[PDB]
């Protein structure tokens, strides 16, 4: 089993609520140039990485209903930049790494979107992928489009309707060989152009679409949500989910919980990846690897982690002494919550989070610790890859690539180059660049019986 | 001397305007959903010195009698395209001065989404993006297609101003110029400079912050098309380039002076908003391989494509009668206003000329020296500030004008020899840095 390899990216300086941006080493406050995705996208490419992911986010910090000062100061979550504009900027530099970015069925258009998309995989020639996102923080994202906030409980509902449309723009409008550009012949057969029609509780279209056939059909979907919806949602339409980290123990459960709800879907239980974020500091020595991830943590300003827990959770800290048993806060408390913090103290909560956020502990040692982890993670979990996660760039992704990878590929874990063209290819491991027959948009092809 | 600027008119499809010559052996752009033709058409312009390339856009198909027929396919009239916010990242990174121009439509983008697409193209772009802000489409086919009703046609504009407005605030008001410090000694960004937005107009609404900091221009350049006295209020408000089509001087110079007046109306300098006329030419060393350089393309496009893209842009089918027919005499309501020029012209002519050009204007067909003549009269003739190029058969055509036409211009002194300032406002408007002038309606947005 050769395992895939990504790297997780963001347009903008700081990520998950963390902000090591001052750590003399980083250079993602250059984000808003294209010379700092020429370099991370070169990298990755050098050294036959799968794909690099473009997160993405429309909302920004809430903190008691206000954003406050802090989050200009260190730079908590504004500014970014549009995740479709770096993917297709990339184009130009690179020929194989695959381009995957977040997009939103809340707030896309999904008519504008398709034809988007599908205009990436034909440049890219079939190197794209989609994060299917449909939450996010949604609050703020929806006064700044003008819209009302769609309840929780419907916006998987939303996102399914979504999907029929994407599906029927991508594989049911335009067969897959109904261009033939022959001046002496034909432009396009036109018995193989196909009008759509879509009529659903959020979306509707009539009529023709604007991109032909893309050369993987339809994006490589990547889906990340962790509710029971969200994992019904990614059983059904993801190729490649993308877990968060855990212990091995809890990994492999969610694993097996995923291959089988796959499996309930009419999918075989191989054909649906699965990748871990991973998150490394590695040093020549172990003393050195623990020290190397103890200056990251100093170097962020201490007022940051208890502004940007109270951003993601909800819950605001500041009052508090560190010792505060967190039995003892004022408001009462979810069950959940209860149970997350019994025994802890607000010190412990706000330590943990200073470092690391939303993000997963990194594994700190010598190379060949770091490659050991990662094969006990692949072998305990039943795991198909890795989303590389970094806490400081570009140093975390070339200090992965230079001394973990290389024993990777001598143990026969890892990939030593690119042997397919197309994402879809090189992650489902297949000669196949289009959707599987099990899959669900395949079921939308008009040359495979599908209506319209 | 006015020093005349020249940008290309390009689109992400094969064939354009209602006319189809994608079968002539030296048309390229059947490729079009390659990266490489788009490397080599940029590679061409930025090598000349060209302000700009131009992506127009559309969003529909064509409609006949309520019908797509097959002929669409046969020959590509309408589709397939890409997107051409996508064709334009994806030639950042082979260019470095030349402007990218896109074509989006205020009656179907999301003005928070946009705004944030367009300055992220700015920002990597450093400062070389446009907008030919479209405030027009096909009320049935494109709005089917996002399942939106039409936003009737009287109120386009109103629209428009309501979307100009909030992107307006989004670009130049949410992010002062120098909000980001990035000092990792100091601060990230400076509080006091980030602002939150509010906006409540009859069509847009956004509360809270944006996105992206201050981009290199602030806002894209902004270019119009758009012939009504309210779209020409329109662009005398908020555009900084305005399209005119083909037009003999004596109207063309009337749409000058009527443009320059809508400007002055807004508090702008006359002068501070420019005018491009497009621009058509066929070249050869003589007049007589011209014309039959010309001829040429005519014939590589199949005869019955014009019957039935002249119905799809206008209505009027007239696919059942003979060629001798004229239009003043047979058949159908025509508007009292619009068919007059259809007296002394039968089918077949209006089908000759529609076969010729589509909305396109009329080529100049010539020696070099004859295209040269006819640009430098057009200019001085109309008060013109540049050139649109549209070209019959690419990359022949955009190749044609750099070698042969190019050079006689700028020996005369019409032209500059090259770029004279990397982003694209500075280029086109002459302005000391690359952001809004400010006596642009947008400048007035900006914080403080």
């Known amino acids: 089993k050769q395992l895939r390899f990504g790297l997780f990216e963001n347009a903008q300086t700081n990520d998950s609520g963390t902000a090591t941006w001052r750590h003399p080493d980083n250079q993602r406050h250059l984000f808003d140039t294209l010379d700092y995705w ?22 920004w910090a809430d ?18 930049l549009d995740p479709a504009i770096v993917a297709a900027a990339l184009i130009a530099s690179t020929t194989k790494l695959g ?46 489009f003008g819209v009302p906030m769609v309840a929780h409980d419907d916006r998987y509902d939303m996102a399914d309707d979504f999907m029929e449309l994407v599906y ?13 550009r022959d001046k002496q012949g034909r432009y396009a057969d036109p018995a193989k152009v196909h009008r759509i029609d879509h009529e659903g509780p959020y979306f509707r279209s009539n009529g023709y679409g604007n991109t032909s056939y893309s050369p993987q059909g339809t994006p490589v979907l990547f889906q990340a949500g962790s509710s029971e919806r969200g994992r019904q949602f990614g ?4 190729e490649c989910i993308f877990l968060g980290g ?11 919980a995923i291959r089988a709800e796959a499996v309930a879907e009419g999918r075989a239980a191989d054909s649906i990846k699965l990748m871990a974020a991973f998150s490394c500091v590695i040093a020549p020595t172990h003393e050195e ?8 943590l100093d170097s962020q300003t201490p007022e940051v982690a208890v502004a940007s827990y109270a951003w993601f959770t909800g819950l605001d800290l500041s009052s508090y002494d560190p010792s505060t048993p967190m039995s003892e806060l004022h408001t009462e408390l979810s069950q959940t919550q209860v149970a997350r913090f019994a025994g802890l103290t607000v ?45 400081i760039q570009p140093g975390s992704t070339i200090d992965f690539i230079e001394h973990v990878l290389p024993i990777l590929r001598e143990r026969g874990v890892a990939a030593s180059g690119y042997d397919a063209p197309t994402l879809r290819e090189r992650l489902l491991g297949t000669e196949t660049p289009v959707l599987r027959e099990d899959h669900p948009g395949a079921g939308y092809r008009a040359q495979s019986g599908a209506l319209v």
Not at 42 to 59: H, K, N, P, S, T
Not at 289 to 296: R, S, T
Request: aromatic share 6%; proline share 5%; with cysteine.
């Open 38 to 59: 020429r370099n991370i996208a070169q990298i990755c490419e050098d050294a036959g990485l799968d794909f690099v992911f473009l997160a993405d986010a429309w909302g």
């Open 63 to 80: 903190v008691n209903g206000e954003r406050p000062d802090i989050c200009d100061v260190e730079g908590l979550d504004l500014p970014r």
């Open 99 to 144: 381009l995957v970015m977040t997009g939103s069925t809340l707030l896309e258009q999904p008519y504008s979107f398709a034809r988007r998309m599908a205009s990436l995989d034909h440049l890219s020639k079939g190197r794209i992928g989609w994060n299917v996102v449909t939450t996010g923080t949604a609050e703020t994202a929806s006064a700044a």
């Open 168 to 180: 029927k723009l991508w594989e049911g409008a335009w067969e897959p060989d109904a261009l033939e």
């Open 235 to 238: 059983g059904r339409h993801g």
């Open 246 to 256: 855990a212990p091995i123990p809890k990994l492999a459960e969610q694993v097996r």
């Open 289 to 296: 690897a623990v020290q190397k991830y103890q200056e990251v």
């Open 347 to 391: 010190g412990d909560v706000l330590a943990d989070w200073h470092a690391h956020g939303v993000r997963t502990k990194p594994v700190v040692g010598t190379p060949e610790e770091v490659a050991d982890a990662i094969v006990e993670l692949a072998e305990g979990a039943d795991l198909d890859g890795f989303l590389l996660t970094p806490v």
